[PDB]
């Protein structure tokens, strides 16, 4: 299977309540491995996965320095963007940053990404070719010129195709017993009469890793995606995931419906029918 | 490992 490393930064201004809230989290696939919280007592990058704990003091000192540098950059950028948008000093504002690299099963680079938001809206993003920026408005356009003058795209591309891919490969090897495991979904179907003439069929997938799964309902063989209740894939809290899909069917016509489960851990896609 | 080439907006 193909893998990703992703970092997520949230900065929220707190006017009259001291410094902005800064939260940084690192992921390999759907597993968090590092965190930083400005409001925590440590003021250190902290491990959140067992396999990162074996990184030495130099790693933790480096990631702490660099994450603090990012928090300081965000503190400045909150002030700058407040200026760009002619906003008052008494309102809370949010900067969000996401970046990361994807590698195929062979461990080779597939793609990289860098995206920035202001108050939950696109601000600036690195293009697919990793050579140029797309600015959302005139404010972001001023940023784009500053980033072009710093040759930021060259450095982002260098990171995403170099250190990002190299460290992801290292993490994948060190944590392979969890990160590179394939747990197939434990599947079952429940039946709950709504009335005398209708009933909900719910198709369950439990204890699966990674998070990527397809649950689909068919009526005699035809897909029913537009009449299917499909909850977001959710973490069980033990590192596995859960999902269900439901359809409301006429009573007596239950066996005309099939739930289809596709997961990497399955050697054969499953077809479930009420028994 | 974090990205470290930080340019202000």
């Amino acid at each position, epitope marked *: 299977g193909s893998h990703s490393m992703r970092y997520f930064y949230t900065s929220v201004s707190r006017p009259g309540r001291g*410094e902005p809230r800064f939260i940084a989290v690192g992921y390999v696939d759907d597993t968090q491995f590092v965190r930083f919280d400005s409001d925590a007592a440590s003021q250190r990058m902290e491990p959140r996965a067992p396999w990162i704990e074996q990184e030495g003091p*130099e790693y933790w*000192d*480096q990631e702490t*320095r*660099n994450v*603090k*540098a*990012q928090s*300081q*950059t965000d*503190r*400045v950028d909150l*002030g700058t963007l407040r200026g760009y948008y002619n906003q008052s000093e008494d309102g809370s504002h949010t900067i969000q940053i996401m970046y990361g690299c994807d590698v195929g099963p062979d461990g080779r680079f597939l793609r990289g990404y860098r995206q920035d938001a202001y108050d939950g809206k696109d601000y600036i993003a690195l293009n697919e070719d990793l050579r140029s920026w797309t600015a959302a408005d005139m404010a972001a356009q001023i940023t784009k010129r500053k980033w072009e*003058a*710093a*040759h930021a795209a*060259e*450095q982002q591309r260098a990171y995403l195709e170099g*250190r990002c891919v190299e460290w992801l490969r290292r993490y994948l090897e060190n944590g392979k017993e969890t990160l590179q495991r394939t747990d197939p979904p434990k599947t079952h179907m429940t039946h709950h009469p709504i009335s005398d003439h209708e009933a909900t069929l719910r198709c369950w997938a439990l204890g699966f890793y990674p998070a990527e799964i397809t649950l689909t309902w068919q009526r005699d063989g035809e897909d029913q995606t537009q009449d299917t209740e499909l909850v977001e894939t959710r973490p069980a809290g033990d590192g596995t995931f859960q999902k269900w899909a439901a359809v409301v069917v006429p009573s007596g016509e239950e066996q005309r419906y099939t739930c289809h489960v596709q997961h990497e851990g399955l050697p054969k896609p499953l077809t479930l029918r009420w028994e | 490992e974090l990205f*470290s*080439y*930080l*340019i*202000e907006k």
Partner: T-cell receptor
Amino acid sequence: AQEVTQIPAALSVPEGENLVLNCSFTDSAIYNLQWFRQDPGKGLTSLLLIQSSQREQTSGRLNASLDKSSGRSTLYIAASQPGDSATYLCAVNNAGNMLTFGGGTRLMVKP
Amino acid sequence: GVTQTPKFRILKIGQSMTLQCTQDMNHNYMYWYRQDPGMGLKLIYYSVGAGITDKGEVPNGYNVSRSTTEDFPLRLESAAPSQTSVYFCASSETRGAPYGYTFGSGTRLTVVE
């Protein structure tokens, strides 16, 4: 962390002769590298500033190079003159450590 | 550019003093370094804007404040022999400082018994 080193710490050379001053740094992820001149009891003068993307910079008889793959920078001085005699400081700027200085090399160009 | 005072000062062991450092360039980033004889500059304290300060490499025995963009004073509360040094203040428009840092002329401090 960022540790900048300049070995040797002192150099003596006859005037007219070409010389190399050495700089090494442990963290190759940098904004830019700077070579300074310092006269006794005085402040800093920026001689050259090499950007992370740039491979060398030149100002007359001064030439500085950059190799991030080995984490090294050398300052070349052509046709050395007694007036070149000073302390030369190597400094590397990055996000984590900011402008970080080596111990310096005391150059004495012998007339 | 960057103005720091005084140029020179003799302190008795235990005496306090404040080194002033001012810039009118609206620079967010300000820095304090010290330099011992035959050594490089070492970062004491830095500030990324008004109302925040952060420890550098060698913060021990010093205090700083950044009430305003303009000023970054360095405080010695109790002069010790080890604080005999040359102190350089600096500023920059950005962390990357593509033009390099703007450095003050320096302050020579001599602590005596």
